[PDB]
Design a protein around this ligand. Structure first.
Ligand SMILES: COc1ccc2nc(C)c(O[C@@H]3C[C@H]4C(=O)N[C@]5(C(=O)NS(=O)(=O)C6(C)CC6)C[C@H]5/C=C\CCCCC[C@H](NC(=O)OC5CCC5)C(=O)N4C3)nc2c1
Ligand SMILES: [Zn+2]
Length: 198
């Protein structure tokens, strides 16, 4: 079926989590129609701002987080896809299925988080709805929610950051641990695992 073989589209930035001020809030920067066309062309002329992007493919939506000049997300969201940019599709510079991790060069205009060196266990998870959820670190890749809630509230937030009290990146949200649909804990990619990948 060589003549008909299709190509998957690019990941597309469709919004961001604004952490600029005192109040965190989600912003949409591209609607579903323009996302569809930008995914096909890989050409995204929109201005990018901030640390946490909301990203989409044709079938999934999740988050992506800039840390040290790399926009990081999960492999279960992005696969091996390019990301759209002003000059066309950009190929991944990191791919690690064993960690559920991918990364591209951070887009012009983004701001990057700094990797945490505090060694603190009082963390904060940022979701696609701009909820800032306290999480106690429980291991290298696990943290417990101080206030559990249904997994529905976390769906679509893979690729988002866990931050320390000082706003540094401690990890990338990967998976939720639940009992009877209630998220009690989170699984995340520690920033050290990104820093060695780099
Ligand atoms: C393909 O190659 C791959 C390589 C490595 C890899 N490695 C993984 C750990 C993995 O896990 C998958 C996807 C995540 C997920 O759903 N990620 C969140 C999310 O939001 N995704 S998302 O909606 O943005 C989406 C799907 C658009 C991208 C953050 C969750 C939110 C809610 C949970 C919903 C029920 C699901 C509860 C699961 N629990 C869990 O597995 O827990 C155990 C891990 C150790 C304990 C869970 O979380 N997953 C199951 N897939 C892969 C795939
Ligand atoms: Zn820190």
């Amino acid at each position: 079926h060589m003549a008909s073989m299709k190509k998957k589209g690019s990941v597309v930035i469709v919004g961001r989590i604004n952490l600029s001020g005192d109040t965190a809030y989600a912003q949409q920067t591209r609607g579903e129609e323009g996302c569809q066309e930008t995914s096909q062309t890989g050409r995204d002329k929109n201005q990018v701002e901030g640390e946490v992007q909301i990203v989409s493919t044709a079938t999934q939506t999740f988050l992506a987080t800039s840390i040290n000049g790399v926009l990081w997300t999960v492999y279960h969201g992005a696969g091996t896809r390019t990301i759209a940019s002003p000059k066309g599709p950009v190929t991944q510079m990191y791919t690690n299925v064993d960690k559920d991790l991918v990364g591209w060069q951070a887009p012009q205009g983004s701001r990057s988080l700094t990797p945490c060196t505090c060694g603190s266990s009082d963390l904060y998870l940022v979701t696609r709805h701009a909820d800032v959820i306290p999480v106690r670190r429980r291991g290298d890749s696990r943290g417990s929610l101080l206030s559990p809630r249904p997994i529905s509230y976390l769906k679509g937030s893979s690729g988002g950051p866990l931050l320390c009290p000082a706003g540094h990146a401690v990890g990338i949200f990967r998976a939720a641990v639940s009992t009877r649909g209630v998220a009690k804990a989170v699984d995340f990619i520690p920033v050290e695992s990104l820093e060695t990948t780099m």
